[model samples]
Every structure is written in C-alpha cells, then in structure tokens.
Target: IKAIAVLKGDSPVQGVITFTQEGPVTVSGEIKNMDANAQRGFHVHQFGDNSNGCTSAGPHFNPTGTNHGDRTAEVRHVGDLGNVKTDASGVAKVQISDSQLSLVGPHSIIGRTIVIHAGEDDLGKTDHPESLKTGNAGARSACGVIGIAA
Candidate 1:
C-alpha cells in the first residue's frame, strides 16, 4: 500500500510526506521552508478534519490509549513518529521506516492527519511536565491528511 500527505502551515513549512508499505511501512519525504537547524515533533493525528485548520485535527491516533512516546518506545501512541530535524538550508529530508504504521489494517493511518509540532518532542524521556502525555511538544505547526497515493 502507498499513501501521501501534503503538509502546510501558517509559515513556509510545507512538504509532501509519502508512505510505502511492503512489510514495514516506510515514511519518506522532503519538508522545506523550515527554521534552519531546527527540530520539530512529527505525529499522526486521529482526525483528518481541516475545518478549523490544523486545529480541527484531533490528538494523536492512539487507539491503544497508551502514553505518548518516541518512535522506539515500547509503549507509545501509534501516531508517535518522532521528530524531524532540518538542515542549514531549512530543508528536512525525512526517511523513517516502522513496523507500527499501517495502511491497510484496522489501525490504518489513511484518512488521518499528519501533524508537525512547534517544539521538539522529548519522546517521553524528559523531566518535563507533559513528557508522558505530549513529550512537551508545543503547539501544532502544520498538518495534512493521509490519502491513498496514485
């Protein structure tokens, strides 16, 4: 299965994220127009609603109701894809593969929302107050709907 999400935000942060599933799902894309040398939290939200802009998209897609964690965490939200770091040119070449993300199963990510946060995700390993819930990842920056790819 294949899917894609075209990201956009208030600022110039925009990109096209693609997902390809053979065995494990692979997420690859190019996010441009970002803060140079910056890192931001990346996640998949539960809803694909954009009526209120990215705000309409619900929280992380955690069907299991688990605590928010990093990509490698043993217990984490299904949407916890971790962070995206940009280069000096303000571009992030995203390349991630995971066994959790699915496109054709009951927990499929299709029709959901992919969101980028304003701050870096502590990945449940921080002393921050929101560490376990949100990884201290700040406000939503950008978002897009996951759809079937041609």
Candidate 2:
C-alpha cells in the first residue's frame, strides 16, 4: 500500500494507489481548481515524463490492447479507469478499484502518468461525437507521475 501525487497546471492532485497481495488495486484522490459542473477525463498515461507538457504523457496507458469503456470490459486497457466529476468548487474526489491492474506488474502504473483532460471520456464507440477512448477530452490541463511516496 502506497501513495502517488499528481501535480499539473492547475491544482495538485493527490491520491493513494494501493495493491492487494492477491486482489485489485485502489486509486483514491482529489483534484482541485476544476470546473464545478464539468466532467473531466481522468486516466493513467503511458509515459511519466511531463516534460513535453501533456503531450509528452502520451495517450492512455492501455497496454492490454482493449478499447475504453467500463472497467469490466472483456478487453479493456489498464489505463481505462474512467472519468471524474467535479464539485461546485471545481474540485473532484476520485476513487476507483479494478482487478486488471497492479502496482508492480506488467500492467503496473508505477512509473506511468496520470492525466486530467479538459473534457469527458465518452466510453467507447458511442453514437456520440467523441473519441471512444479519449472521449474527445481535448487538451491536457494537468499531469503527474506515479511514484512511491518518500
């Protein structure tokens, strides 16, 4: 059980990402300074370097070759945990649990990135006009790396 903190352009997002010895991993955190009524796209990225800004973080950390959707999707990616809704104060509290990911496995997020986009995640291949995996989230607002807490 450990925690990782994500800092970006706006507010600093902090959360605890813990892995059970033989179960699922839990990611719980809070994001500040967001649009109150807006639904933000929150996901784990393939890279950890926020150097090139958000673009350096790359796309979702989908190493499993699955499209984005529900967490129970048969072939979903490891980074497809879903979206986060903010409160009236533009703040969001997040908590997600999944059995497909690990803190120290092939699908581990230990050294990857967590990104918060300006829009929402529209699941996958919906009739709506948005990228199924990215939900047409637009630009990146903030980003952070998943590292063991010192």
Candidate 3:
C-alpha cells in the first residue's frame, strides 16, 4: 500500500490518497479556508500541473463514457467523484472508496492529476447548458499529481 499527500496552497486544500494491492482505493483529505461558502467540485484530473495556477490540470478524468454523478450512479467516470461540502468555517473533509481504481494495472491512476474547483458540480444531464461530464466546475483552484510513497 502507498499514500500520497497533497499540500495546502492558494486553493486551501490538502488530501491523502491511498492505493492498496487488492482492496479498495481510498481518498481522505480536507479543504480549508476556501474563501467561499458554497459547495466545491473535486475530482482526479488527467494532468498534474498547478503551473497555470490550477486550470492546467484540466477537466475531471472521465475515461468512461459517463456523466458526473454520485458514486453509485449507473454510469460514472473513474474521476467523477462528485462534490465536497464546505462548512461555515470553510473546511471540508472527504473520504471516498472505490473498487474500480488501482495502481498496478491498465486502469492505474499514477501520473494523473487531482483537481479542486471553485464551484459546485451540477450532476445533471442537461443539454445546451453545461458539460455533463464535468458539470462546468469552473476554474481549477488547486491541483496535485498522483504519486506513490511508502
């Protein structure tokens, strides 16, 4: 097993993602002082470059042909992790587990990106409105590259 920690930055977020050999992959972390009082979109991305501030990370890593929805949705992307709730103190703790993610296989998540957005993700399939896959999560506020650490 291995764990990766994403530090705090202008985005005010920190996360710890863990990958196991046979069990489920777990992501547990916290976002603080977001400077906002609303829900924020959070998910794994395709790249890891907080260079362009955060937008460099790009959209959620939706390899599967599915829209953004709950974890139990009939069709959901590998990175369609839904949203994170922020309290009045601007802190949001998250814990998610999925059996579809792995670190040693064709579906490995290594070398990918984890992105935090500045707005909510409207998990609905509405045409002529927003991206069904990303729900128009707006600009990326923070990002971290997925890596392995003992």
Candidate 4:
C-alpha cells in the first residue's frame, strides 16, 4: 500500500509527502520552495481534520501516552519523525524506516496529519514543559493529511 499527503500551504512554495510501503513501511518525501536552506520540525499529528487548518489537527499522535523524542528513546511518541534538513533551495528529502508507525492496521496513519513546523524539534531532551510535550516545536508552516493513494 501507498499513502500521500499533498501539503497545502501558500502557492509556489508547497510540500508533497509520500509514504510508500517498502515491505517494511518505509517513509520518504520532500519539502520545496522554502527559505534558502532550513531545518524544520517534522512529525505526524493526531488527526486528518483541516477545518481550522493545522491547529485543528491537534497535538502529536501520541496514542501510547509517551513523551516526545526520537524513536530510540525509552519512551517516545509515535509521531516523532525528527528534524528535516532542507537544501539551499529550501527543499528537504525525508527517508527513514519505522518500527512504530504503519500504513495498515490500528496504529495506521491513514487519518493522521503530517506537519512541517517553522522551527526545530529538540527530541524532548529538555526540561521545558513545551519541550517535554512537543519538543517546544513552534508554529506549523505546512500540513498534509494522510490518505490512501489513488
């Protein structure tokens, strides 16, 4: 199975993320037309709703009730995909494998939201409350809802 998220943002500068199940549910995608070279926060959020824009998507998809951090952490949210480094042209290529997320079954991301933030994620290694919860990751710059590929 394959999934895609057509990130809806301002014109000319948008994002398109695709998750192709490489037998092991591999994830990969890109963000284009950003400010020259940027490292932005990236994660999957709780809902696929877009009524109130990105905010409507709610917090991180933490069905496991764990702190936000890298997957290697003793306890980490399932949505944490870490920082996405963009090129000089504000473009980013995401390629990673997961032992948590899936495209099939209950923990599936079919109705979830993929959010690209305007800042960085500290991997929940800080003492700040915001950091503990969302890695203190700031405003969302773009978002896309995951859905089955056509």
Query: What lDDT tens digits, residue by residue, belong to model 4 across residues 15-61?
Result: 78888774456778778876567777788999999898888889999
Q: How many clashes does each candidate structure show, in the order listed?
A: 0, 0, 0, 0
Off by over 4 Å in 3: 7-21, 35-37
The best candidate in terms of TM-score:
1
Error of 2 at 90 (Å): 0.7
Off by over 4 Å in 4: 10-13
Better candidate by TM-score, 3 or 4:
4
lDDT of 3: 0.68
Candidate 3 positional error at 98, Å: 1.8
lDDT of 3 at 10: 61
Q: Per-residue lDDT for 102 in model 4?
A: 84
The better-scoring model by TM-score among 2 and 3 is 2
Off by over 4 Å in 2: 10-22, 127-130
TM-score of each candidate structure, all chains considered together: 0.94, 0.83, 0.80, 0.91
lDDT of each: 0.89, 0.71, 0.68, 0.82
Candidates ranked by lDDT, best first? 1, 4, 2, 3
Cα lDDT tens digits for candidate 1, 1-150: 899999987767789999999768999999887778998899999999988888888888998889999988898999999988999998889999988889988889999999888889999998888898778888887889999997
